[PDB]
Amino acid sequence: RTTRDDLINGNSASCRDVIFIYARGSTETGNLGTLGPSIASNLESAFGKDGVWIQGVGGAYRATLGDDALPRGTSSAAIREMLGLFQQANTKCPDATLIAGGYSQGAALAAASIEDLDSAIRDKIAGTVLFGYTKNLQNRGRIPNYPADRTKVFCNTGDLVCTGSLIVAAPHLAYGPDARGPAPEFLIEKVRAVRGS
Template sequence: MKVASILTLLAGIATAAPVAEPVEARQLFGGVGMTATEFTDGGCKPIIFIFARGSTEPGNFGFIAGPNTADTLKEIFGAGNVAVEGVDYPALLTTNFLPSGGDPTGVSDMKAKLQKAANCEGSIIVAGGYSQGAAITHEAIEGSPAQVVERIAGVVTFGDTQKLQSGGKIKGIPPQNFKIICATGDLVCSGTLIITVAHLTYSVDGEDAGNFLADRIRAAQSSGGSSGGSTGGSTGGSTGGFDGSSSEGLGASGGGILGGFSLFGEK
């Protein structure tokens, strides 16, 4: 990478600083913040969302793409029914230049958290990442055992540094369960590490991303819980039922991976 591109990268990330103020306001009113450890702290929930932030973002969840996506899921299914967890890694700029595009520390942490989530018999897992976190998402999922990958109902990435290199795919995840969100003018999505203003705008796409994941959650619940819908979900489950705060009228209930608990109303 040429020095000019690195300077562009640094300058672009610096322009993101003003976004922190509305994030602080959202945290004040109870939204998901820049650090999320709900799965680690609270254990299994009906829905587990694991997300890898981008380079230089604070906390373990960041502020550009993750929080609004998580908030949308909580609004749809009820805050108590969604465990949100960030991936712990340094999020340095330099690890973008590794062949895989992602920090091995983040890959290891995300793989471990996906494995732990897959041990929750009654949970539906969704995942995602932004920028370098998208590269980590690709590698973590592709490096996970098949029995873990088949439990992942949906994946969304933003400003995906591996979009071109991966052919827009994640091995083991059916195409209909994977969505890459790329803003017009985001050169990262064209296989570069040149950061333009477009790469820093993904907070506005959280609702779209959350709705996509919600649709994949509904599909997994109705088809038995696996990412492809061909593997039956476990019965029983360790999460218990929804807490009653989830939205009603979102779809028909079914058996599937929740072991008789309905995502969308009375069982």
């Protein structure tokens, strides 16, 4: 449940049409944490197990407490890891539509990764969802170099990380409903749209 490596494990001759790369929050377990499994099960309901590959950002990304305070909201090692996953998706499954997401430090990680990504690969990311986005105020609610229409930010009233702090308050732990409903519906609608005509 909390650890999914579908992209790394996936048989390349049977690539999924959709690949979801997700980064967990600070101190969370597995490579999906608390919110990722909810999003994943909904994506699976839409595209089936063979239609979407769920890949959590593991490896060098330890979701360490304190790394939140680094300049980009996470470590260089973590950014390298996620950029590496995007690159692997691009080469292993060139025809796949990518979708991404992150929560807490993971949201900062997703934003930094997408900002640094090669433009050809970045164009393949149909949609990105961010929960308790730690760089929300700093980046004015956007992911640098990425269009607003493909971004959905979930920042609760009272979630201090959305207003420039790093402190964890009650509203920061209340994104479960968003992960089970609006977030996957957004991602699915974006995929359906780009791969449709």
